[PDB]
Structure formats: structure tokens, C-alpha cells
Design a protein around this ligand. Structure first.
Ligand SMILES: O=C(O)[C@H]1O[C@@H](O)[C@H](O)[C@@H](O)[C@@H]1O
Length: 301
């Protein structure tokens, strides 16, 4: 069959878009030409939030979204959203590739989603019209976050005025002054044109919230077991491809924003990490959550 998958990013060569297309090619091979995937980027099938609900009801086969908007519906996705959980990108990758990531993916089935893969999204940092070098600078900042209570709390802990909005509204919000800041990785800041509106990128690196690729359980459950396995394998094998493309995009977008006049500011990251204890207290509240946070931070370099 020809499955459909959604992506919010406009660029046809964005790493997450390229990665699901690659998955589709692997799936065609593994299935002897039976199954294919068509990727609808440019949020053609809806915002992230909208596509998650379409997948839930079986109207959309796959969606590639950030863990952020999955935080309430698949609560263990909150774990890798947590601020300063991972010590580095390498640590994130090892954690998500291993039993921690796999447990989180499997946990989404109770909510109607087959978790298939985590894709790299770098580290997220604040961008604004002024530098944010300490949490004191963040106090009162009118900043957009993704649509989850955890995300609101995470940035609120910095003293900022966190405002949940869908991604597609961010560019205009920054241009018109409806919001004064947002936060994201460099490729997003670049490709969504946020850099056109605000130039100061303060490297708070306050989350490494990865992407998650989910399939509709309703659709998955109707396929033969052997074909379910093909889909799982194609997804898993696409992660290495996504990561290589992601590394390349990080470099390209950094060059782009620097050339466009972005001011990249180094910060006292401990200023920001020092305020996050209560976010763990308020959100990492179940035994599974506590065990997974510990498992991540027990992971050896
Ligand atoms: O901030 C956001 O909403 C966006 O952040 C980007 O990093 C994710 O790639 C994209 O999936 C999210 O929709």
C-alpha cells in the first residue's frame, strides 16, 4: 500500500523529511515493492498537534513530530524532553538507541501509537531580540514554547512568560511582536526564517527533546506480522541516515544564520540548570519516569 506520513517542516530536504523518505525506500525494498511511503511536509496534513490526532484515529498512517506535543498523550516522551537530562548529543543518541528509548517507544501503544524511531533534533536554545545569558535575563521574556504543560513549566522555571503555540505561527508572531522570543535548534531557527525576525541566539541548550516517528496502531494492527516487522526495521535503519543528514544541516544552517547576522551568544548554562530541580519534582512523578531518568544518567560514556 501507499502509506502517508506528515512533517511540519517546509523544506523538502529537511533531515526529518529526507529520513522518512529514506525509510520509505527501505520499506519498498524489504516488502518487495509492496509498501511505499509518501511524505507530506509543509504541514500539508495539519499542525503537529492535528496530525497526532489524525494518526490516533487511523486517518493518517504516520506522523513525524517532536516529543513536545506527545508529552501528554504518551507521557514517557516527557523523559527525553527534560531539561539538561543528557550531558551531550552522544549521550542522547546512546540513550535513545538503547533500552531507554525502546521502552519509551513501546509505551505509546497504550495511547494508540506505535513508536518506531527517535530522530535527532540537536539542542534547543533561546532566540530573541536581546541576549539571555543568565536566568535573570530571561525573567519576564515573552517566549513561545511547544504545546505541552511540561514545556510551559520548563521555560517558566527560568522566570520567562512561556506561551504555547503551534510551530507554524511562530514566524509571524516574532515578526509582528506578538511574541518576543522562541527556542529551538539552529536548523529550525534558520529554515523557519525565525532568524529574519530575531537575531540573538543564546545557547542555553535547555532541552534535547528528540523527534519521534509514530504509526497509527489502528493501521499497524491490520497488517501481517511480517510486514509490521518490515516497518519497524525500516524505521530503525533510517535513524543513522537522519543523523548524518542532521549533522550536515547543523553546519549548513549555522553558516546561514551567521552570514545573515545572527549573534550567537555563549551562556552560563549552570544558571539555567540550577533552576530545574522543581521541574523534575513536578513532572517526573511515576516509578517508570524516575527509573528511566536514572537509567539515562547511569549511562556510561
Ligand atoms: O518547535 C517546534 O514546534 C518544532 O521544533 C523543531 O525542532 C521540530 O523539528 C519540529 O518537529 C517542531 O514542530
Amino acid at each position: 500500500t501507499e502509506f502517508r506520513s506528515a512533517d511540519t517542516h517546509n523544506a523538502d530536504d529537511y533531515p526529518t523529511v529526507a529520513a522518512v523518505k529514506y525509510m520509505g525506500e527501505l520499506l519498498e525494498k524489504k516488502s518487495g515493492g509492496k509498501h511505499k511511503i509518501k511524505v507530506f511536509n509543509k504541514q500539508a496534513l495539519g499542525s503537529e498537534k492535528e496530525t497526532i490526532d489524525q494518526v490516533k484515529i487511523g486517518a493518517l498512517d504516520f506522523t513525524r513530530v517532536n516529543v513536545g506535543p506527545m508529552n501528554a498523550i504518551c507521557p514517557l516522551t516527557q523523559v527525553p524532553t527534560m531539561p539538561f537530562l543528557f550531558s551531550s548529543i552522544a549521550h542522547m543518541r546512546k540513550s535513545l538507541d538503547g533500552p531507554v528509548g525502546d521502552e519509551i517507544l513501546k509505551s505509546c501503544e497504550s495511547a494508540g501509537f506505535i513508536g518506531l524511531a527517535f530522530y535527532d533534533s540537536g539542542a534547543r536554545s533561546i532566540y530573541a531580540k536581546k541576549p539571555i545569558r543568565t536566568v535573570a535575563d530571561a525573567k519576564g521574556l515573552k517566549i513561545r514554547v511547544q504545546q505541552s504543560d511540561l514545556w510551559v513549566a520548563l521555560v517558566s522555571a527560568m522566570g520567562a512568560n512561556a506561551t504555547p503555540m503551534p510551530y507554524g505561527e511562530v514566524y509571524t508572531g516574532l515578526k509582528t511582536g506578538l511574541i518576543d522570543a522562541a527556542e529551538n535548534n539552529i536548523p529550525s531557527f534558520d529554515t523557519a526564517k525565525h532568524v529574519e525576525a530575531v537575531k540573538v541566539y543564546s545557547k542555553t541548550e535547555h532541552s534535547m527533546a528528540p523527534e519521534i516517528l509514530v504509526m497509527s496502531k489502528i493501521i499497524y494492527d491490520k497488517l501481517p506480522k511480517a510486514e509490521q516487522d518490515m516497518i519497524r526495521a525500516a524505521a530503525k535503519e533510517s535513524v543513522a541516515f537522519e543523523r548524518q543528514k542532521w549533522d550536515e544541516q547543523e553546519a549548513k544552517s549555522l553558516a546561514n544564520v551567521k552570514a545573515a547576522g545572527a549573534e550567537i551568544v555563549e551562556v552560563d548554562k549552570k544558571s539555567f540548570q540550577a533552576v530545574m530541580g522543581p521541574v523534575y519534582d513536578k513532572f517526573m512523578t511515576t516509578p517508570d519516569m524516575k527509573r528511566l531518568v536514572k537509567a539515562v544518567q547511569d549511562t556510561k560514556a
